[model samples]
Target: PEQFRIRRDKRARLLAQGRDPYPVAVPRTHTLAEVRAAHPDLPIDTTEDIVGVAGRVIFARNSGKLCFATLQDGDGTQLQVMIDKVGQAALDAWKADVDLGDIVYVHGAVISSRELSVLADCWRIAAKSLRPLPVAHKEMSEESRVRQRYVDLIVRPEARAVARLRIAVVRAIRTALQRRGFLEVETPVLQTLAGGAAARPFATHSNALDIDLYLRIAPELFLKRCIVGGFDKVFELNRVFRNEGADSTHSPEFSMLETYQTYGTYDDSAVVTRELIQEVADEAIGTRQLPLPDGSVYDIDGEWATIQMYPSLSVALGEEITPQTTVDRLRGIADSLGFGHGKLIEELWERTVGKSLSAPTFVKDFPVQTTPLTRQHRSIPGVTEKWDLYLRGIELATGYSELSDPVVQRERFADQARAAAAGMVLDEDFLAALEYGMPPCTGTGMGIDRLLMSLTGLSIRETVLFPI
Candidate 1:
């Protein structure tokens, strides 16, 4: 409490001196990254740095005679600002007014400590930070860091590194889709009914519409409508809201890549899924292998493995579960494990075979109840032509031969409405859109957060800059 108060008065004193601690009209010569990048050789020149350098004062050392401080920008790029030439004006001001958390600029020359440093003559306080930094140069745990991301981005260069990687990952996804002749589209965040996925909807009241609205659980239904509207291929990269609990993998609000292709079966979607992943990974991580937090390395160079969800889960659980497995039997298994609903097979597969996978793997021929929009199995009686990709035991994407039959889809909707315990309503409009005869299409919903996790070996919270 005392230290916080202390920081405030120091900011007050700069104002008292008729000095503007926070100056905005002045322009920056070079960001620390740009100057450093332009001159990797360093100390080799000071003539070009006359434009003036600017960044947060990351490191400050006051030696009574000379002051050396490191300025860092958002890129987490660092360059030192040494003020031996400015004499007493620079030294006294830095020692008396400047603190670690202050945002300041350096008027200096490009000098290297060995190879590179932005040596300075004078300093300008860009922003008077009234709050003390969390650390000199360290990071916080998930509890503190996610709560106060503003501070963590400074102390934890690696956190910012991950953020940069996420941006690259998104760009790569957009580029990959562009090369495939997919046009990006936008959909509303609020809808009358949720039809895409079976997730709890976040409800809200709209005074303008004078009615209640539900934040979309997924953009799947809307993207499908694009297909029905004669857009052969369409994609949406946006946020979707779900009234679900957040965990290591789930965030109530998260990014998703929902893509649909006409005349593309589940097999065709699988091909796109595999190639798109490798394409994104190669550009972002720059390698086929990612080191897991569990001390194992994941190799993504080859084809992602595939197996029947039924037999692989059976092999792992030692319980014979097949397409014909009875709902009563599933309920019995779930009840015995202290879990509810018909989640026995889902849990069994996730804990056993899914966790053991080192390379990316796909679980196909899912029991139809896993999702309502999937196509019925072509050869089998009850199973569905759906596939879920899991990497390091985490579900990354779900792809399927989407159900296009209006009759079957409406039936599925009726079943879901009957069984929907979470106040889920059937979307009549989406069902009607289906009546217009949507082409046989395959679509996939990929969690951008989860994909980042698979690429960078981070949890959902860490991969996203602001998890909330």
Candidate 2:
């Protein structure tokens, strides 16, 4: 009330006058966008006989004998609302009740101007906004927009369109996968142990089970189990939890698209991944070559430069680093470089080599130490047949030849399991399934939010509807 007394007082006055102010309904014939599309070449002074629209009041002004206002709808389109004086044809509510952020209905003859603004005649208050829409910060990028995204959605059409685009992106991905015979499935969110990937997990205790369960860090192990159980191709697009610090590009809980294809190698899966991205882009964004928000563009379907990582990783650190680099020495290197202690392999790769991989490129043959679940290279020791896709200095997707050799898989798990935290148990059932034999397969995980951020030039947080 203290922040906005004038708007509230108007609300109060309307209520006292027995005007609901926020009337339940406003009958409308067509949307503002329809109004625009319906009259593309109308003469300047011509008018659409009658039109009705409902949108948020962005700009409203009251002059001595008339009122003028602007209404913006969810599609990021705008229309003009104009009214006459008190003795004029009845429009609901006083000009006082039309707050800047309030939702309002306009009914009247539409006029096309020489300028772009479209006009609406009759106007009514449809809903009240308790809090004013935030103005852009005078200082900079307006961080408040993201903080109060709900208000941003109301006040900005482009913001609303981004949200709708994200929804379409997900749908396109699902449809593309389904056409390729990939079955979309869900895995358990709560697991006995977060066995799929090397990341700290969020823990929760269930009273009924009388035990603690972890929010899965990745659905890798479960999806692979489905592969072993005769589902030749399976995929899951869902949220995963990792108890980690946040960044402009990272979130503690985020969405991922994981897919497993039987009888496919890393190279084959790489081709499929590329085609999938292009397909999704075509369906959702209308292009195979995506234009970046930073005024650059990338060819999603064209051949990408491939980098063999082991040799180039050494180049980044200005040292002769090998797969045999000891964990202790690696940790020391990370700490000295200000990347922290554990996660040495990732720190070293990212800091040294991954930073330079802008443009759509694939980095392959990663050190096996970094990917315990990856298949060993045919002729190379301590190297895994894995690849990560990068674009605009960001890693978008990761896929690899999956380790199906039961014995090798067992040994790999043993190597990592000894360092497991308390209450952490590796996937025993998955190992047992491996003993029953899993065919040669390839698997990949794509971060959905980061991909959209890269494709649409939004930050990871901005791409999400509700980021916390």
Candidate 3:
């Protein structure tokens, strides 16, 4: 717990001794992989040939006469170092100057030890580590681990693995979209109006413009504008902010991938969504059937089940959730399901039907009231062509057969304004963009972080490299 004090003392000592512990640049001559590839079976007395390497000292073992340590670099690999047979000058400098938590560079050669393992021949202190790491004895608590994730990454291999998988997932998604003829586009994070999702936004000021700006809650509106500007297939991956409570499922700032395909419907996007996730899961773990948090495997290769909202909700809750189902009828079901009165319809759906459909399933044709930007299903009469993909009991994505008719789109925006009058911020500029004539398209916003979490069997905090 006195790690802070130890770090400060180390820094002070280095400063007093005219040694800069936190130097900016250090040269690395070889990686662990490079050393292994060059000489798989190094000789026992290979100390004459020296090589330089730099990394964090993860494990250290001292056998009184000699020291053994393992260094970890950003390559997701480690190499063992042996501080023996080095001349007296170099040996003494290492023992006296190096610390366990310090990042150090070593000049060593691959050599065979009594244990028949490749070991370092000679070593030196390239850089001094200042702070003692969060050791096993003083392990990081879960609260601190998520808050100070970088430290967790340093100390925990599992945390680092989760981050690595997340990066791979993002790259895979980008690749998948690009191959499908999607044009990646950039959208402004700061906007005068925030729509696309039903979440409160984080606001800031632009001093130069003397205007208040909001961190975009979703890229949906701006991305659609790209379609209006002649790029029929566009996608954007970026951060969106919401002023909301933090949970295992919720974060104030999160990453989302929003994509639109002209002339496509929610059904087409649904198929794409399922296949994209399966591909990502396979890429992350080398298989499509992944183990869930509960230890059961989800066979994601097969066709996903689809149910309309009214039917799915009705079956899951043993009650009818028709378009004719009044607010009172929904409220009655919510009450029977142990939800309180005055709960929003969305919240009610989440508790009963949403919670029941745990496995990967898509529920389509939601009530028109639920998604104003979606096109009305011609045959369904009262439901909009909207669908949500759920996996492992979490909403992975929400898509819709987009509302491309400018007149109907304007009416929907007006309805959104009525809701905004009560509290929400309806993005008027987005409605105007729709009036500029967007193509008949389908759009979906996928939660990249959540998808990685489900695939890798990691919590939301673990998937994120740094979370606040």
Error of 3 at 384 (Å): 0.4
Give the winner by lDDT.
1
Q: Write out the backbone clash pairs for model 1.
A: 112-117
Query: Which structure is stronger by lDDT: 2 or 3?
Result: 2
How well is each residue in 1-468 modelled by candidate 1, as lDDT tens digits?
Answer: 477887799878888988888776557777777787687754444354564878788677777676678778777887777764766765777788888778888776676563366666667788877877776334466778888887887788777888888899999999999999999999999888765886889989999999999999998888888999999999999899989998888889999999999998888898899899999989988887777677877887788788987899888767888866776887766556563223556776776777788668888887776667989988977678888988766788989898988898888777767775775556778889999989989999899998988776787888888866
TM-score of 3: 0.88
Q: For candidate 2, which ten residues in a row score worst on lDDT?
A: 84-93
Q: What is the TM-score of each candidate against the true structure?
A: 0.90, 0.86, 0.88
Better of 1 and 2 by lDDT: 1
Model 1 accuracy (lDDT, Cα): 0.81
lDDT for position 299 in model 1: 82
The models' CA-based lDDT, in order, is 0.81, 0.79, 0.75
Candidate achieving higher TM-score, 1 or 2: 1
For model 1, the stretches where C-alpha displacement exceeds 4 angstroms are 42-49, 84-87, 113-115, 119-121, 136-139, 313-322, 328-356, 420-425
lDDT of 1 at 349: 70
Prediction 1 TM-score vs. true: 0.90
Provide the global lDDT of candidate 2 against the true structure: 0.79
